[PDB]
């Protein structure tokens, strides 16, 4: 079982290296924990396809054997926040796979199996704490607005609903209160979305 583990970790590290290099090529840089873009123009089809092959490979391996993906995300702390921040720069066609990676890391595998109808619990809790530590208020607000209200597709909205629910369930009291206050501040803008 170890041999599969080393293969999975090596392949995932290579894929994340490739993704980071691809984003570097177009002026999008992750310096310490913030992703910054120099150009306000959208990406091109070839860049999206080269992103999507790597992301599809990562999503497949994470959906098959979630434990190794969670262990990777634990070892490298600049992965989940990087994916969350990069999901804002890419078009609506690549959002589902990024949300799937986030959900497999955070929501869990058995919850996804149940929706399709004990170590992973501590892994999910640790990953949720790491995400809460890295992410600030503006990024969470932007994630909620972009994937719960502004998205035209309903599958993406359901994915965001599940991800937010499982992020809330695994946090502490103070972060739960912060998230509830963020959503109650977002609420007055409801008529803009119907």
* Residue found by looking up tokens 């959002």 in the block: 95
Measured at the alpha carbon of residue 22, what is the angle toward residues 99 and 26, in degrees to the nearest 5? 105
Cα Rg of the chain (Å, integer): 17
Under 8 Å between Cβ of 36 and 23: no
Helices 119-134 and 154-169 meet at what angle, rounded to 10? 100
Q: DSSP letters of the chain?
A: -HHHHHHHHHHHHHHHHHHHHHHHHTTEEESSS-EEES--SPPPHHHHHHHHHHHHHHHHHHHH-HHHHHHHHHH-TTSHHHHHHHTTTS-TTSHHHHHHHHHHHHT-HHHHHHHH--HHHHHHHHHHHHHHHH--HHHHHHHHIIIIIS---HHHHHHHHHHHHHHHHTS-HHHHHHHHHHHHHHGGGGGGT-
Resolution of the experimentally solved model in angstroms: 3.1
Instruction: Kindly state the tokens that stand for 29.
Output: 């840089």
Residue from 78, 81, 25, 77 nearest 51 by CA: 25
d(CA 66, CA 104) in angstroms, rounded, equals 7
Please count the CA atoms within 13 angstroms of the CA of 77 that sit on its side-chain side: 11
Q: How was this structure determined?
A: cryo-EM
């Amino acid at each position: 079982e170890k041999y599969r583990q080393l293969r999975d970790l090596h392949t995932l590290d290579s894929h994340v290296r490739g993704i980071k290099k691809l984003l570097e090529e177009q002026g999008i840089f992750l310096r310490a924990s913030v992703v910054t873009a120099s150009s306000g123009s959208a990406l091109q089809y070839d860049t999206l396809i080269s992103l999507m092959e790597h992301l599809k490979a990562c999503a497949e391996i994470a959906a098959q054997r979630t434990i190794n993906w969670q262990k990777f995300c634990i070892k490298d702390d600049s992965v989940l926040y990087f994916l969350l921040q990069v999901s804002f720069l890419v078009d609506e066609g690549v959002s589902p796979v990024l949300l799937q990676l986030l959900s497999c890391a955070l929501c869990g595998s058995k919850v996804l199996a149940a929706l399709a109808a004990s170590q992973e619990d501590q892994l999910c809790t640790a990953l949720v704490n790491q995400l809460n530590k890295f992410a600030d208020k503006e990024t969470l607000i932007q994630f909620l607005r972009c994937f719960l209200l502004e998205s035209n597709s309903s599958s993406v909205r359901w994915q965001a609903h599940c991800l937010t629910l499982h992020i809330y369930r695994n946090s502490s009291k103070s972060q739960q209160e912060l998230l509830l206050d963020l959503m109650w501040s977002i609420w007055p803008e409801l008529p803009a979305y119907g």
